[PDB]
């Protein structure tokens, strides 16, 4: 089914993923459906994690299934908080 | 050599045969129906027509003839039968053709 | 029959000026007149006016020139140095507002015919419209 996962966009030893919505079957760095975030696993910037929290919701709402790592980042950005 | 996932081939054969079989039936009864319908044997032809209907939808339950393919078959049959019957005798067994 | 009455006029004017004529006639047409209107406004010509050479409508175009000059060949400068037909029958040229050309950093002009009427490049530009780029002049 469609997914929300990480696409590799950094460079050798300089990873930078794009939190993405794409068909599970597509190659990972291939044509995604929508960019909904980005993550710098090495926090080399105070902005190593950003998520279109609304947009995430949208897709989750229509079946998007997140990778475990993707889900993790989504939680961190408060995509699942209720209060 | 030796990729145990040639198990898929064995299955395909079993499946193939299982499919091939249901279809043969379908055809034979269908023909049978349009035949009797074409001979004015209303009650008899509708009787068989229903079998064919049933057998078709059943075929559609699984991969056999699954789909609108079933629908098409049913349609095309209830077509020929009702026409051939209109070309002479009234629908007795009320088979499946509606009022 | 003239193949292109506009080029014809533009030319009569080009020719006449080179032998420094005072006026010069041209078979009249409203469109043709509309062009003269600009020529006049812009001060390339003294002006024009209808007339009837043999009971047929023409347009006297009174030409302007510079002052007599110094040494050999005291012929005055031309007010209308350049005047070239652009869009032609057999190759019409149309331009969108963002493509109206800038004739000689402004020292010159371009006459386009637009649905809002015949205008100079600045006018057309100001009025936000394009059209058939008729001819340039400077």
């Amino acid at each position: 089914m469609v997914k929300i996962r990480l696409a590799r966009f950094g460079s050798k030893h300089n990873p930078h993923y794009r939190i993405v919505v794409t068909d599970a079957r597509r190659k990972r760095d291939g044509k995604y459906i929508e960019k909904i975030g980005y993550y710098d696993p090495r926090k080399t910037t105070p902005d190593w994690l950003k998520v279109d929290v609304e947009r995430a919701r949208y897709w989750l709402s229509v079946g998007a299934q997140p990778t475990d790592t993707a889900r993790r980042l989504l939680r961190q950005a408060g995509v699942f908080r209720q209060e | 050599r030796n990729l145990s996932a040639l198990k898929r081939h064995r299955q395909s054969l079993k499946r193939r045969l299982r499919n091939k079989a249901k279809k043969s039936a379908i055809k034979t009864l269908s023909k049978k129906a349009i035949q009797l319908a074409q001979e004015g044997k209303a009650e008899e032809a509708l009787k068989i027509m229903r079998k064919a209907e049933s057998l078709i939808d059943k075929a559609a339950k699984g991969s056999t003839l699954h789909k609108n393919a079933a629908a098409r078959r049913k349609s095309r049959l209830m077509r020929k039968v009702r026409q051939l019957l209109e070309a002479a005798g009234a629908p007795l067994i009320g088979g499946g053709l509606s009022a | 029959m003239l193949t292109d009455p506009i080029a014809d006029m533009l030319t009569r004017i080009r020719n006449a000026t080179r032998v420094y004529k005072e006026s010069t006639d041209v078979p009249a047409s409203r469109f043709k007149e509309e062009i003269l209107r600009i020529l006049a406004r812009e001060g390339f010509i003294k002006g024009y006016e209808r007339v009837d050479v043999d009971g047929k409508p023409y347009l006297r175009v009174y030409l302007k020139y510079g002052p007599r000059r110094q040494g050999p060949d005291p012929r005055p400068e031309q007010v209308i140095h350049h005047i070239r037909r652009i869009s032609k029958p057999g190759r019409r040229v149309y331009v969108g507002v963002k493509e109206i050309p800038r004739v000689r950093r402004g020292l010159g002009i371009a006459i386009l015919s637009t649905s809002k009427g015949v205008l100079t490049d600045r006018e057309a530009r100001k009025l936000g419209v394009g059209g058939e780029l008729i001819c340039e002049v400077w």
Binding site: - | - | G90, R91, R92, V93, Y94
Partner: protein, 104 residues
């Protein structure tokens, strides 16, 4: 939106089918000059309703046959053999080119 094209009927020699000639003018990609090309469309006429010389609207349609993908929307005006003529003449010229030519 299904394309709607306007053209003239040049042929009704087909059962329920008329050939509609359609022109379009436009700037030449490099030379500017407005050039004018054309194309024939085989449109569907189930009622045989339209005739030779009719100017009609053609509309994008579900395939009716290999080669037939348009239906005759409506009659715009009719009786323009002039357009038919041109086409016919232009066609006449053809068989007057190759080693099989003929008239002057």
């Amino acid at each position: 939106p299904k394309k709607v094209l306007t053209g003239v009927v040049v042929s009704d020699k087909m059962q329920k089918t008329v050939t509609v000639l359609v022109e379009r003018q436009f700037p030449h990609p490099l030379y500017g000059k407005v050039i004018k090309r054309s194309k024939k469309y085989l449109a569907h006429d189930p009622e045989e309703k339209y005739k030779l010389g009719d100017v009609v609207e053609i509309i994008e349609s579900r395939p009716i046959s290999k080669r037939k993908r348009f239906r005759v929307l409506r009659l715009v005006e009719s009786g323009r053999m002039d357009l038919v003529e041109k086409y016919l003449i232009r066609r006449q010229n053809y068989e007057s080119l190759s080693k099989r030519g003929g008239k002057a």
